[PDB]
Amino acid sequence: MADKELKFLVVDDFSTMRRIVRNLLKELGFNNVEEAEDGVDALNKLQAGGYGFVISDWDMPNMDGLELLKTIRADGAMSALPVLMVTAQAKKENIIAAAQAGASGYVVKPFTAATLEEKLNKIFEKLGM
């Protein structure tokens, strides 16, 4: 996956968390990044088209990460979009529920750029990107 212009959507209700993820992506060379504050905001942006990767917080108001993921996976236009779930605390039950709903990966925050890079590269490889 050599497309450094792959378009990311970073979804989290905390603006500071979004800025952290955006800055880590920038460090890796991924600058084509937009933000959303909950699952509905995210879906509105995704329908505008052009996105290549979603990084979503697990716990958000109104529409949480699991519901966002399910909605993406059920939509024929975006059903193959990579989705990386982010959580403050790994839980077996959540990991399995996310996998059942089609998550591409799952990672615990706070994470470093190196950890993010590894997550992304393993997802790109798993998905044949």
Per CB under 5 A, residues contacting Mn ion are 13, 57, 59
Indicate the DSSP class of residue 6.
P
Nearer to Mn ion, 34 or 127 (CB): 34
| Nearest-approach distance from CB 52 to Mn ion, in angstroms | 23
What are the tokens at 26? 């920038």
* Shortest Å, Cβ 78 to Mn ion: 22
Nearer to Mn ion, 6 or 12 (CB): 12
Q: Indicate the helix (H) or strand (E) that contains 25.
A: helix 15-28
Closest by CA to 6, choosing from 41, 32, 45, 37, is 32
| Complex with Mn ion: residue 56 or 104, whichever CB lies closer | 56
